[PDB]
């Protein structure tokens, strides 16, 4: 004695019951060990990328995306770049973070970005890497991004330097269509000796740290 | 919490992998060699892997229009022979897996396992079918699933189109990979160019 | 309270459900006890089975495909036979092991070949049996099967010799539609006494090994 | 082996069965504390709200409507109010515990009226409240009022009555579509020193007690 009820019978594309096997006897090919299993995309999630900072028409076809110029023969009051904070937009988007998180409708979580500096082992300069929060807007100068969140970068000294953004808004997670921005200024002139070249090249990545998630699963036309 | 991004969350959701349509008045039957690169936006997703296994579920949404038809659906392994015509000996073979279904009746559902005899599915293929200049490259070399063929059991003027839904189960992934950053051109190529 | 899932209802033709019993009330007839019961095809496969080695148009249709000529009368450069190892296909093909494997779309295991010496207790001879690995390709000469592996069988002391080739490939499987092959040479001419035939004849056999499997059961018309 | 029965696959609206989840690995958005979470709409009944006593067509768009004029110039002899105690009718029924009960067929249990007397301090005055049982008929006059169930209330002595009337009919509930009166009534004149207002207000107020329950909801016309 049984009453079906009003869900009996559909397919519901999202359901989990069990369903016959078209082939039992069958035993299917043992599974081996085979290096480097991803249980989570997670785990994908927390590795550096490159992030295309140098978005330019002659560069978006090229390996120059990738990289920042540093020079003696510049204006040395305007910004050497910036990045807005958010994963959804250029040039977060198209980052392994960003690519991942365009498969979630909300992210949370830190992000860890990485800057690190190629020009030769003569070649000596500080950078200003600044931090501006969500909705204070991004800094019109040098001055204004050392009042703020920042790190003064020695290349010289270091080759390597990383800022880890926490999370920062009301709800526990955000659309994945601010997070505020990470802006670069000059401290000092490019200085290098003899022989050597005036110019070099910084190269920004982007990682999430093991408190990030995501939620809420979508297909979309970001890729055709 | 972060379930939503395991790898059954993000491989083995139900989807609509293939489209099979046909025709009655040979003839009244079709086929469909099984395989995930049809469609783009299933396609970029089990390409994040180099090499995935699965067992799958697949669930068949039939529509048609001019008693209640009666439809063959018949799985055929990989290796085993693909019918020919709508009467063929491969139809009555018990070696196949065959689902008899009639209309309204609920949508046909069965799991066909890891059929493959390699230990995983090779998403790309560094590697030929053999010597020659012909020989195929890629994962078309790899990875036969097997054959679903459809035919109508009834009779006699009709038109068929099953849709037919594919969840992966008890997924394992390999070796993460780039995601596709351009449009794909072609089934199992990594061709990108217009 | 139930709902009936999109399985509810088919015809699954490798289904494995319970069903009525037609007849409650009959008793079927008591199972007796009778000889050689079957419980697995790997039983069937262990026996040794001539194989069709002399496949010539004057032979396929008589006793005279199974057996190989030996004779005093010959090129003693030449190849006496050569047997590819794949079961899927001539000679091994209508043996019983190639024959039950035709059932199926993939197998492993070791192959034992057996080789019967059918000449008088007066004639003697050796000769060389070779085994060349998967992708080596075929010897050319005795000198180049003696320096594979092989037996120098002396058919004047051992009427029967035996090589069993073990399962070499990349998958734990192979389809039944290469293994490499068996050659045999001879390393002497043939020996006989007065009043005794010049000639002989050898039997070659084939049967599975207890380390034997076969995978993914299909019908085909490989038989019409 | 099941039969189905007389209610298989029905659609009852008021049915409770399980139904499958459309989202599963969607984990929902974590329950933080909110103050004021409500469990029963008993606790919303529980909570004293205005009674619109003085509906008279000058005052039912305006604030007015919920004050009862005191004042030396009046006839003494004349009721100052009535309020049928039935929160089914005019002026209870757009009270916050008339508006709940609106939602359910029958209700039982005590109600709480209040009286709050907003003349000066100096101001003083004596009003009598009546409560009379359902069937015996509204008072004629303070006489018959006073020989009832009464409080003779000094609102200069005490800013603030209360009356509870407890529940009263032949059945555990009764229909949401009588309870008594209650009759207010001067027992002195409007007592003030010079420089007073010679008026007040006074404001009336219904709640539940904790007795108090519905029972049988339903949905009307009564809001458009």
Redesign the interface.
């Known amino acids: 004695p049984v009453m079906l009820t009003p869900g009996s019978g559909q397919f519901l594309t999202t359901d989990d019951t069990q369903s016959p096997s078209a082939f039992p006897y069958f035993h299917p090919t043992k599974e081996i060990f085979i290096p480097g299993q991803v249980r989570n995309l997670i785990e994908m999630c927390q590795v550096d990328t490159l992030i295309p900072v140098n978005n330019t028409q002659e560069n978006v076809r090229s390996v120059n995306m990738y990289t920042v110029d540093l020079r003696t023969q510049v204006d040395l009051a305007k910004e050497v770049f910036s990045i807005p904070v958010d994963i959804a937009s250029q040039p977060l988007a198209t980052t392994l973070i960003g690519e991942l998180a365009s498969y979630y409708t909300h992210w949370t979580g830190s992000l860890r970005f990485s800057f690190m500096f190629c020009g030769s082992a003569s070649s000596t300069l500080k950078l200003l890497i600044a931090y501006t929060p969500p909705g204070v807007g991004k800094p019109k100068s040098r001055r204004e991004a050392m009042l703020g969140t920042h790190l003064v970068w020695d290349v010289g000294l270091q080759s390597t330097a990383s800022l880890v953004v926490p999370w920062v808004s009301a709800s526990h997670f955000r659309f994945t269509t601010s997070a505020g921005y990470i802006t670069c200024w000059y401290q000092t002139n490019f200085v290098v000796p003899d022989s050597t070249p005036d110019n070099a090249k910084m190269v920004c990545m982007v990682s999430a740290c093991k408190d990030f998630c995501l939620r809420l699963a979508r297909d979309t036309n970001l890729h055709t | ?7 059954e ?2 491989l083995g ?2 989807g609509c992998i293939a489209m099979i349509e046909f025709n009655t008045s040979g003839k009244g039957f079709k086929t469909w060699k099984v395989s995930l690169q049809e469609m ?2 299933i396609r ?2 089990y390409e ?4 995935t ?1 699965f ?1 799958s ?1 697949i ?1 068949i ?1 039939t529509a048609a229009a001019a008693g209640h038809i009666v439809l063959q659906f018949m ?1 055929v ?5 693909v019918p020919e015509k709508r009467d063929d ?1 491969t139809w009555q ?9 009639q209309e309204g ?16 599915y090779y998403m790309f293929y560094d590697g030929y079918d053999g010597d020659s200049a012909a020989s195929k490259y890629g994962s078309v070399v790899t990875n036969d699933m097997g054959t679903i063929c459809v035919r109508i059991v009834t009779s006699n003027d009709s038109n068929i189109v099953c849709r037919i ?1 594919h969840k992966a189960k008890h997924i ?5 990979r ?4 351009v ?1 794909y051109q072609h089934t199992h190529s990594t061709n990108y160019i217009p």
Do not use: H
């Open positions: 919490t972060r379930d939503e991004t395991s790898i969350s993000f959701r139900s783009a936006q970029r997703k994040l892997f180099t090499y296994r067992d579920e669930t949404v799985y392994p990989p290796g085993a022979p000996y073979s018990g070696t196949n897996a065959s689902v008899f279904w009746q609920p949508y046909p559902r069965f799991t066909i396992p890891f059929m493959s005899i390699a230990s995983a839904y394992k992934a390999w070796c993460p780039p995601p596709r950053a449009a």
